[PDB]
Paper text:
Here we present a series of TIGR03971 SDR crystal structures from several mycobacterial species which contain an insertion in the primary sequence at the NAD cofactor binding site. These crystal structures demonstrate that the inserted protein residues almost completely cover the NAD cofactor, only leaving part of the nicotinamide ring exposed to solvent. NMR experiments did not show exchange of the NAD cofactor, whereas binding was demonstrated for a number of small molecules which could be potential substrates, products, inhibitors, or artificial redox partners. Experimental results are consistent with the notion that the SDR family enzymes linked by comparative genomics studies to mycofactocin do indeed keep their NAD tightly bound beneath a protein structure that may interact with a specialized adaptor machinery for redox exchange.
With the exception of the M. thermoresistibile target which did not contain NAD, all other mycobacterial SDR target crystal structures contained NAD, which appears to have co-purified with the protein after expression in E. coli. For each of these crystal structures, the adenosine mononucleotide portion of the cofactor binding site is enveloped by the inserted residues and only a portion of the nicotinamide ring appears open to solvent (see representative examples in Fig. 2A and B). In addition to the insertion loop which covers the adenosine portion of the cofactor, a second loop which typically contains two α-helices covers much of nicotinamide mononucleotide portion of the cofactor. In contrast, this loop is ordered in each of the mycobacterial SDR crystal structures presented here. The combination of the insertion loop which covers the adenosine portion of the cofactor and the ordering of the second loop which covers the nicotinamide mononucleotide portion of the cofactor results in a significant decrease in the solvent accessible surface area of the cofactor in the mycobacterial SDRs, relative to other NAD- and NADP-dependent dehydrogenases. Only a small portion of the nicotinamide ring appears available to solvent in each of these cases, indicating that the NAD cofactor is tightly bound and potentially non-exchangeable. The structures presented here have a cofactor solvent accessible surface area of approximately 18 Å2, whereas other NAD- or NADP-bound dehydrogenases have a cofactor solvent accessible surface area of 82–89 Å2. Given the encapsulation of the NAD cofactor by the two loops in mycobacterial SDRs, a large conformational change would be required to release the NADH cofactor after a redox reaction had occurred. To test whether or not the bound NAD was exchangeable, we performed a number of line broadening and STD-NMR ligand-observe studies, and did not observe exchange of NAD/NADH during the timescale of the NMR experiments.
Author numbering:
A (entry chain A), B (entry chain B), C (entry chain A), D (entry chain B): 10 to 286
The structure:
Amino acid sequence: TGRVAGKVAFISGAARGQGRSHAVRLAQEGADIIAIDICGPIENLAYPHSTPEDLAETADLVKDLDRRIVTAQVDVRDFEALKSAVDSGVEQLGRLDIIVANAGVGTDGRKLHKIRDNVWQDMIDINLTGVWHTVKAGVPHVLSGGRGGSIVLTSSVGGRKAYPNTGHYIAAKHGVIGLMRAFAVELGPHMIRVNAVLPTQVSTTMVMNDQTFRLFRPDLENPGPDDFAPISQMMHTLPVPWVDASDISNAVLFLASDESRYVTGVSLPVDAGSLLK
Amino acid sequence: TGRVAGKVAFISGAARGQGRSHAVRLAQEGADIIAIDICGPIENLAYPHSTPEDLAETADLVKDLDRRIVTAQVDVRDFEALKSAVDSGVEQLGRLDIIVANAGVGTDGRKLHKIRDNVWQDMIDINLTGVWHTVKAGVPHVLSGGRGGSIVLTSSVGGRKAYPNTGHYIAAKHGVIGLMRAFAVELGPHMIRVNAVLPTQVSTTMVMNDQTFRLFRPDLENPGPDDFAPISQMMHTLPVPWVDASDISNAVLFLASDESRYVTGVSLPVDAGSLLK
Amino acid sequence: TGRVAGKVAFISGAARGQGRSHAVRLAQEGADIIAIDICGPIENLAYPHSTPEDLAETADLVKDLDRRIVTAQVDVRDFEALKSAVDSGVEQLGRLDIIVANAGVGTDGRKLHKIRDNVWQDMIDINLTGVWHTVKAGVPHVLSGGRGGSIVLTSSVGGRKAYPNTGHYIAAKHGVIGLMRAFAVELGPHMIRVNAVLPTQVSTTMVMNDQTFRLFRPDLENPGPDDFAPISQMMHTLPVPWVDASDISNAVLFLASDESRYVTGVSLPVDAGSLLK
Amino acid sequence: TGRVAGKVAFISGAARGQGRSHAVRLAQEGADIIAIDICGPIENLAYPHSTPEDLAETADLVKDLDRRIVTAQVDVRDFEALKSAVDSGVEQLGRLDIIVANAGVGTDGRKLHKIRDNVWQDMIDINLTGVWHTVKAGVPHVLSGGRGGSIVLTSSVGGRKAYPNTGHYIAAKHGVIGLMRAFAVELGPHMIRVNAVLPTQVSTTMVMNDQTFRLFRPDLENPGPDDFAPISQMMHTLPVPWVDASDISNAVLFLASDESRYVTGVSLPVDAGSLLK
Ligand SMILES: NC(=O)c1ccc[n+]([C@@H]2O[C@H](COP(=O)([O-])OP(=O)(O)OC[C@H]3O[C@@H](n4cnc5c(N)ncnc54)[C@H](O)[C@@H]3O)[C@@H](O)[C@H]2O)c1
Ligand SMILES: NC(=O)c1ccc[n+]([C@@H]2O[C@H](COP(=O)([O-])OP(=O)(O)OC[C@H]3O[C@@H](n4cnc5c(N)ncnc54)[C@H](O)[C@@H]3O)[C@@H](O)[C@H]2O)c1
Ligand SMILES: NC(=O)c1ccc[n+]([C@@H]2O[C@H](COP(=O)([O-])OP(=O)(O)OC[C@H]3O[C@@H](n4cnc5c(N)ncnc54)[C@H](O)[C@@H]3O)[C@@H](O)[C@H]2O)c1
Ligand SMILES: NC(=O)c1ccc[n+]([C@@H]2O[C@H](COP(=O)([O-])OP(=O)(O)OC[C@H]3O[C@@H](n4cnc5c(N)ncnc54)[C@H](O)[C@@H]3O)[C@@H](O)[C@H]2O)c1
């Protein structure tokens, strides 16, 4: 009945936001879940970090749908710990079909020639190398199951075009597109699809925070979401200021399900027409 | 509980193949249908043409789903007849929400500097100008309904890259991407999404014919589908020789439904990884 | 000594503007020229048309460089007359190495679903089919010379993205990109390169006219180039309001010369960063 | 009368190969040179590393052209040493106008989920982070000169599509496209252009080595260049097996000179039609 009935999905960054939304949506449609998140502070994070209670709440939501979920608190930069958590989760759930490499950060925001080395490096470590780590940890289990699979990497509008003062994020998200194409070419012969979703602004903590509001409305002292919306909406072709996590989850579900069985190598924007500008 | 419950979809080329599949798939998900097709011969067509009986069979399939359907025999090259058919269908069904500009041909197959003027022109007339005519005829009804909507143009892998001896088709299908982007920019402010699907080989009459087998297997005497499949599969990253009409319809359904409410301006390949080459 | 010494170049639209500039620039660098232009009125042209005296002035400029030039007044929509003029010019100059498909128009400017059929059709005939006609007329002579060659098609920023109210031009210029890729794939095995140049606004008659000024500054009564410049400059990443014909000619020269001997299939924007938006 | 008369160009990886060719080609056209190279071994390098004598030979070639050159042995991974070298070169030559971020490696060659963590990281360090370091070190001098300038990043065909067993290289080279676009957007307002060149196989040490021949011809015992060439040529639309360093330098010269004064944000393939496939 469900669009991914009988499948198992591994989701990074599942404590909250889009990753929690992917976990719930795929569980609604029949999938059991391996959910990991760092659940702690991140250097120079421009907004509140996630907590262990966040990930436990994702787990309760999935359990409420009478689906199984394995959670682990792990940093995608630690490959050996990430591999260990994935291995244990697949040992419990019995298979791995879907990988959603969703964990990521937004930090800092300077001119690209002024970004500091460690701020550049943390961005590359999480948003590019951490994506590679995530796919690398899960893919041996998709291969050994021998049933094909579907892998979704979260890039960004910033993986195809640049906005000022985000250049380390831009470079990482472009590199995610290259990871999607490389994995797609290499895993295609095993009927494993690899695609990317490219969101515009999404109404998560990564956007709905004081730092982001102030960068978009420097004219203001205490800018709020109402003041940020008109600027953000000017980036879009549809008259909306941002999309929701459920919009990204619906794209991930399409890509994860048999309804896209022959779709691979695709950059799918969920961007309200940002990339038409 | 259908994914396009309460909607009306206008579909060109609906007598058979992908267009028939789109009408049946959207009807399964709750939409009433306006279905048009030339139902008649086309100059230099490399395979059997459609019949009035084909479109009557599409109507029977949609009515078996307890949905309403208006059909019409009309050539997308004849804008006034097309507009009159769409106006009458909308008067009968009460609204228009979805347009799928699917009608098209494959003809001929020569070096681009050797294609005859009228063969080039018929291809541009049907596969590029006919698509514009189709959207132009439908969009006043979507606009006047005031509920937004979703428009899907059928391009091709050949809308993004070229294969030898199909250059008039390549040119037209690239133009269709242009139409998608222009319509998306102009109609976005009215919450009307415009996207394109880009199929690889699909198991329809346009591909499954003797002229195609020979354009792919000159070495053979009377090549059939089994001799064509290895060649067609070499164009793909996934090990399949072609996709099915239902694969295109699943992509069209995604783009037509509220699950893609903020997806616009997108070229969505359904191509088994062709564009990764 | 010259960067295209000993070569012959066929240039459409050479009466004025970019095409005249290509003729002079290639002649400066050693090439003899076949120059054609309609040299007369065009339906619904939004600015002054070219004259026979324009083309004679291009000829004098080329002759002043002690280069040979053949001119003909011919419409690129008339393939038989265009082929006849090209055949005669190659019979005189002895070879054909370079083709620049530069002739084009800007007309009208309505919402895409309101553009009239004949206005759409004239746009397609000149800017898409006329480009095909141009390449088709010249390419048998490049092939028969057996020395390779280089073919440049003038597309536009509008061949990769859409601006409102130009959708027939957008569709045609996208189709030019498809022509470039199709010809590139088919002619590559004969060492014939095929590329496109994609200009932003260029300071020619096609942009520097009252209609264009008024469309960009509706707030004004008599808007001039000084009022148009700030709006046009907002489309660019570099702080300039437009590029010059010589900027396009320098790109065409690079592509025409042995310095790009292995460059083929490329869309080269000369766009002040428009496509970064 | 040189095409970059009076300019200063800073070039990374200038000891040999394309970087040496860029220094010599820009010097031929009138530029003074700041040339840096590690001139030393690199972990897991699949071919001979460069030497201090290589870079001294680049200096001799540039001085034979009666141009000035400052050389330095520095690793692009070490930003402070890199910045110190560039600061000293600019103090000696008086200005900086052109930056060519050319230094890079090819290493290893495994399935992407089997590449070891440190092999991945060295590739990201050199081919992505090293490029950022190179532009970051040079651009304050271009900015403070107040004359605009031109920056060229060396990506690859692998910056736009993937080949099997090179996924860490693919990811890094895609990131380099991101860097080009971000730098172009941020530096455009200062009339500083930023573009990328995308080579196919080039006849340098990075390709002409025994490990590459075997990664292309497993069937052979000791494959040489003649057994590699047919395979490499099948990746191309033009019938050549590779391009030469001089072909890349001609593209770099175009992008560095005033003949491309309004070209920015462009990915310029020099690829014999690879990206047409
Ligand atoms: N939010 C946007 O506007 C936007 C736009 C483009 C792309 N994205 C991408 O969407 C994805 C999800 O972000 P979101 O909007 O859900 O934000 P979020 O901050 O609400 O969620 C991201 C989650 O990733 C986790 N995470 C971050 N670094 C991690 C690490 N090193 N190891 C493990 N877990 C880690 C975080 O703790 C957090 O729970 C990210 O890749 C982000 O770059 C977001
Ligand atoms: N079949 C493929 O491999 C392939 C690949 C890429 C794109 N496509 C595109 O998919 C779309 C559907 O084709 P299909 O595979 O269903 O083939 P098909 O020939 O079975 O269906 C196309 C339908 O379009 C109708 N049609 C053609 N010209 C018409 C006109 N002038 N006016 C009205 N109706 C007209 C035909 O009568 C036919 O019923 C077309 O745009 C085609 O170019 C197909
Ligand atoms: N000017 C711009 O801002 C801009 C932007 C993008 C693309 N372009 C393209 O640049 C090319 C040259 O335009 P321009 O800026 O030199 O303008 P222009 O009007 O000064 O020159 C174009 C020339 O093409 C000739 N021509 C037009 N239709 C013809 C036909 N049917 N047969 C023969 N000759 C014909 C015209 O008579 C004219 O002499 C065109 O393809 C145009 O679309 C221009
Ligand atoms: N050769 C090809 O086929 C090919 C294809 C695509 C891209 N490229 C790119 O072209 C560029 C030049 O490579 P090439 O073909 O001249 O090869 P090469 O190995 O002859 O030259 C590259 C030079 O970069 C220098 N270098 C490497 N790492 C460095 C570091 N950390 N710090 C300083 N210098 C360093 C090397 O010492 C060497 O002198 C590279 O970016 C490469 O990735 C080459």
